Symmetry: none
Subunit: 927 residues, 2 copies
Amino acid sequence: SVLTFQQAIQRLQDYWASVGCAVMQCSNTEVGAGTMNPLTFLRVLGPEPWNVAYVEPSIRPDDSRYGDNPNRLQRHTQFQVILKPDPGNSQDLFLHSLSALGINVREHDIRFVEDNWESPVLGAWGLGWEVWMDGMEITQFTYFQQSGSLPLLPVSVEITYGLERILMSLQGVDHFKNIQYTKGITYGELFLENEKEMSAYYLEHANVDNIQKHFDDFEEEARSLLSLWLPIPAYDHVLKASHAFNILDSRGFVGVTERARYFGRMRSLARQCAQLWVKTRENLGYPLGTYQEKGVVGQPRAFVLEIGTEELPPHDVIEATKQLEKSLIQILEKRRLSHGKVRSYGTPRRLAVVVENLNMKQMEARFADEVLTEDLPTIISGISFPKSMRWNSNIVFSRPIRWIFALHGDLIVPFCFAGISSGNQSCGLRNSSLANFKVEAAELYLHTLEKAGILIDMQERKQRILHDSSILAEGVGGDIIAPDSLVQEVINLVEAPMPIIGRYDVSFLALPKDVLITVMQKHQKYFPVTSKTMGNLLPCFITVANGAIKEEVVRKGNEAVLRARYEDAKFFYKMDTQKKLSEFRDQLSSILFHERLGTMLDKMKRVENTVAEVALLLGINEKMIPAIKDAAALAMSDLATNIVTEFTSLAGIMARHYALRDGLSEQIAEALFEITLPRFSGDVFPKTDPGIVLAVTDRLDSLVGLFGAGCQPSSTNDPFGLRRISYGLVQILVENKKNFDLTKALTLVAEEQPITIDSGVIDEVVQFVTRRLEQLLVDEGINCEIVRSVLIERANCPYLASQTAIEMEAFSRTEDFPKIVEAYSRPTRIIRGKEIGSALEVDASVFEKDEERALWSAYLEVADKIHPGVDIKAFADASLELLQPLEDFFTNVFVMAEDEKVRNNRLALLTKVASLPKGIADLSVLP
Amino acid sequence: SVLTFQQAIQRLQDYWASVGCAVMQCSNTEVGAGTMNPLTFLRVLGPEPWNVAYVEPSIRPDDSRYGDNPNRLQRHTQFQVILKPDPGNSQDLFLHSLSALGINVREHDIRFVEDNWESPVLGAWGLGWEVWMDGMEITQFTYFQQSGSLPLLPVSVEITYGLERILMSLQGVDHFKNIQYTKGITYGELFLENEKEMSAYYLEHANVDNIQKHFDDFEEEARSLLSLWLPIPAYDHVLKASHAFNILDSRGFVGVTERARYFGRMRSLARQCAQLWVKTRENLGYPLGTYQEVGQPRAFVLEIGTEELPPHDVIEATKQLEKSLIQILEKRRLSHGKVRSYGTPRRLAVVVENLNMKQMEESARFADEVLTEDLPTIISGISFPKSMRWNSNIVFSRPIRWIFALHGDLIVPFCFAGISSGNQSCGLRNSSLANFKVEAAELYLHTLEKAGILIDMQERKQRILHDSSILAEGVGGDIIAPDSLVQEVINLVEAPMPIIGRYDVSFLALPKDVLITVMQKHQKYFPVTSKTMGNLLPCFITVANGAIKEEVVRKGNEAVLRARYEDAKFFYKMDTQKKLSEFRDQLSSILFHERLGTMLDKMKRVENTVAEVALLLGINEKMIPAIKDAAALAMSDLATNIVTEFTSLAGIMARHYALRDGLSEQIAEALFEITLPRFSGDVFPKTDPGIVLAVTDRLDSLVGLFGAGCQPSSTNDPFGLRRISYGLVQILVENKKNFDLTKALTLVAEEQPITIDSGVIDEVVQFVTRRLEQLLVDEGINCEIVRSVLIERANCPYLASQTAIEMEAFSRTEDFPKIVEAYSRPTRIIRGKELEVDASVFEKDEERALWSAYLEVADKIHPGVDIKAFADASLELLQPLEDFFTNVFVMAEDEKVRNNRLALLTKVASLPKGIADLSVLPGF
């Protein structure tokens, strides 16, 4: 017999008590999570240590499903663990807790996947993970950085279990009602009627007027109690205000603007309770405690640096390894240290760089060990992330650094960082024979990792993932659908890829194929499988497990998770079948785009009113406009559907499906899907003309409106995703070979905006988009300056500019290029500052030497063969006709003649010569 | 080493989960008790089973003491267990739960003492006990009978542990803040600041206006959800309404009359939620399942083995069992030797020596068969003031768990309460003879003696008194053992083991009566007083039960007594900061009745009536000014802290505090005496001022409440008006005081806040006369004699008591029938006819002779004579009346002559008026 719910509670309490926690009781006032319990929100504040564990019934009125959905609950049961300060081995304590539940962590696939917890109501945030057990989210795990808008010291670790989820996964039940609570009694027998009636209360019957006035009374009493220096009752009243607001929300009486003001009042009161609680603890003397904290130079040997971390997000692994390699190479150069090949490797738990054949000393001079002892700490410090965190010091990092391996040949490079000393020791796969190992020479590093089951090269990981998954899918007569985006994510969610094929119920094949593929890929990171013969989805998937796990266990686990996910999808689909897409569209007024911009419905009305002119500027025939406008009237209405509010990754897909299911046009349904493409780096692009028009218009509208709203992105904060929005816009225009007048269309949508848009806002957007086009072309493999020189003159049409960039990278290698460039550079350099040359017309009657008329005649013919819009080939070939005339001119004509009229005529001539490249490229940047 | 708080919680959850319970979570809304959690209140309804266990933080805003008191907490932690239906061995399961907490139940003294839980506002009640561990209450144990004003079927067993107290005595710490919650952190470090800040919120800073409005909105929302057929949210809002009310109460804004309105609103909502929940479980199909239900003569022994019965129930049940068994043995012609009944809290027994094997022939069957069909009726006849069900519809004081019935070597086989009789019994729990069998009825007693039980109650009483007085000798002292306390201790044990323990000499500074009442009433201890100085020694005797460890039990009892005495020391210090007269104004916070006002109004009415009542009682007028002073302080102690926490000290404390303030011992004694008698068997007021105070207060209650409509009319006498009137007539008869009931009642009426009509006076007179009647008839006087007297002399109860006694003596004279007849004949004659005598109209000589004899006997017979003078003078009429009747014709023709003779007969028949109405007598 498998574990019962109350058995799980008892075992978690016993376990965490054996580690030194106090097993407490739940809040006797309604909280949405154990985090809101004073045992968490207040006790993380100040320096006093705090190690506690308690069950918490968490009440989220928004999740009321009357018990009808197999997994959604207005009351679920968290197990809340706070450890303060961080003991340093919190992950291991949690895995030990799992074993205490009878779980075999070796056979199961326990994964730490990025998920950062934050709370506006509480003014709190941290960084950490969601923990998957065989693909089931069972625990949120967080290093708390800030609470009550106060920075935290020491940092606490929060481990929050979802007991319903864990029991459903361990018992293998598909509905929460059938969880074994104790022998003979199921979860449903105790709680289904509660779920039913409490849902009825939260969604339909609660008196919203009295509850709003009660919210006000609670605010007033909280302020009163704070002013009386009584934080405990005051925060109690803050919790009551939060529950009241949650009920007003679930009843649907929080308007879209009121929401932020409500959160602001709750946050203000919470910050005040926090500061008052800290003052109170201070006045008490912090009674629970306080917190604190030669020979003959030899041959070049290999140098290995490995920073071991707790699981980093994939983006963080990529960018950390890039930065580490660049920084180390630069420092090695600046320190006269020579070396061979340099290669960097990454992994959720490790960042490594290998320098082959690193010299023992510098040129001209200390040993490399000394130089590195002093430069490596600031190299690691130099690594930066969009989000970092403290854990036991002032040092920040994406996730905690737990070991540091640094070896030059046979010798440790000694240094400290983040309170970690360097050594010759590393960690393998958890719960394995080489969970800890030591390497006695850098040249033995990779070998030893290979002996520990870790494939540290991300490309070898890609190859094994793909090869093994394809073998598995061929075994059932199928092919994996494994886009590179998802493969890239999976590569950095594992260290020892182990693909495993599992099955799902064929009943779910009755769901739309795009729905199953999206659920699989974007929510479970599974590879779908399609038949090699029929071209249809086989009821199969591949999961890339990590480590030496038991195939059978992991398979059944993930199978149960996927069944639950498809059941959620089926539930919300059936909920949507009753209405028709047009009925949903009016509920776009329930979603804020931005306070000073309006709802998604305001946004759509804007899009409708600009879509036809965007179409004409794209040069699509005047005959597709009606349909475009038609599609514009139904765009992103699926944002209001239940399925998309549950699965945000189905926007566009569901608009298409619910449109076809209404007999609407195939091309209109495709337009409704295309307006969202590309959805992510790797996605496909809109390919149908009205889809192109819709997508382009929506991106222009977001850009102009958000930039005029002051949401111009920064180096690290782009909450609205403007950078990828602009990148995708230029990508859409290039891939579909669409000529565009960027400034014209941006002014076009600038007129439709609810706010006033300046010419300066439009110029801001044009520059932002141009820089993303530069990024694109330097990412597709075009030289930097060759791109800049083109974009200076042709950025206003992204597709023409792209073409021109490629053509001049061809130009760049053709022998004549340098001579054409010099030909144009000399007149440009001479006429700099002499605006007189731009103010005069050349007067051929002022010529004095035949070389002047020769140059003038040649210029006039070349000006005829060169227009703004010409291809580079014609430009270069026509510029060839100036070479000899210009050489003759510069050998026999004195440019700075002492007669002002002749000198000015000569400057004007050189000015017209230098003006030919205008609107093609600016050779002032080219080599 | 020692158990921590959280290990106690884990061990309790683990034990009750191992028994089949489901371990739940605490309420996520503030509840004052685990009982209030819907897991109990709602779930005990309907036939569905329910076995649950959960920790419940209970929030009592009035218990806010800022963490300074070592026991009273605005937030304490109960452990709640509900077993439904009753498995039948809940006491055993609870004792096992104690063992799972590390408690050695053999060495400790674990006692089930009567304490029947009830929550009027939740419409719920049950019968059961509070569990004492070496004297300290640790657990409430209740068989729930009714919840939400609805009868329960099947009955649930509720077990509520007080965790703070349990850990405090398991850890040997006398302040909650020093409980080891876990290794390294004390209870204080986690909760003292919470106690401080929440105490401030609940007592001084909570917004009472918004909490009032929130109570109203909560009642509105509960109503709305009730009409929508949603019991769960409705009940949630009832809970929130209760917590809001409690905060209003602790803030001090619930007026003394307002409280009843609040109480009714809360109870109405709770009852409605309970009814809707029952309907909803019915509409759901009760998904959890439904409850289902020749020979030489030989000694006979019957033993009904029960769970712990209250002392009074033991006494009364043994009396009833003996009586009924004797009667049906006689009515069934079964001859037998002597019969003796025995009893302990756990056993009711009757031993019939030499019961015949067969009926006397006068269908003469074997004795075992007739007893087989008769004994269930005998057991079913035993009635108690309070009864309860457990497995069926049969009711008893506590559950019957076994039945032992042996006639010689043979089991008398029958069935009762789902229990089949046998030869098995139960000894002391946790003993080698906790289960034993008896082979021969004649071996029953000896067997109990070897199980260590003293089943004879006089035997128990003698060993208790002896061993306690020996321990008291050991310290040069004597035991204070009033008969009532001893009676109770007799039936709190079944193997008595007296133990002496000490308390601190500081407490000797507290008044004698406080020390004694706290010892006797609350702990059931024997005080010890010095044989030399007569003053109290710092010693006590507690009578433990069973083969306990003397050291453990003594120490636990000493800790409990120290705690109680520290509370008394604190409250006495508070009380002696004001004069007793300064407490009197707080009697306005105690209602007497919504129509009659508060206790302050009642005492003002007493002090405006006390002097005229004294004169009506014939008190020395020079005592009147003291009497009045007494009434100006009477019952002032009800608002003191000592009495508020120790309610048995009312009157006693007014006496002590008056003495302290400098008042006479006479006045102070009157202050204690206004309350007597406080119960049947209590002492009476003996001093004149105390008698006056008691009489006046009782008259005031009677007149005011009868004017208010509270006259009983049936078995429901909530105000105790019957007991009040009984005590009043006893104060008069016992102190030989003459009194005019009617003028005193009128006097008291003119002072009431409501209009008292003459009919109210007449009805109170009739009611009090009826109590006087039952009292005299309880004492042995013939009902007809009592009625004869009370028709004429009830307005003075003491005179009527006198007259009924002496007239009952008269009733056994040989002259009695003669005087009754001599008054009967003329009276019957004239009492159907529809009144001066003119001697000029006399014709015959017997006429004049009768007139003469009557005139003389009349100047001897007056309203107010004794009965001897009545008899002796009336004797002088016997022969004159005979001669008048044989020689004179009343129904004469001459109307004036006839009506004159009739008038003479009327004068003769009107002599007994004021003495007794002879028409009700046997013979008239």
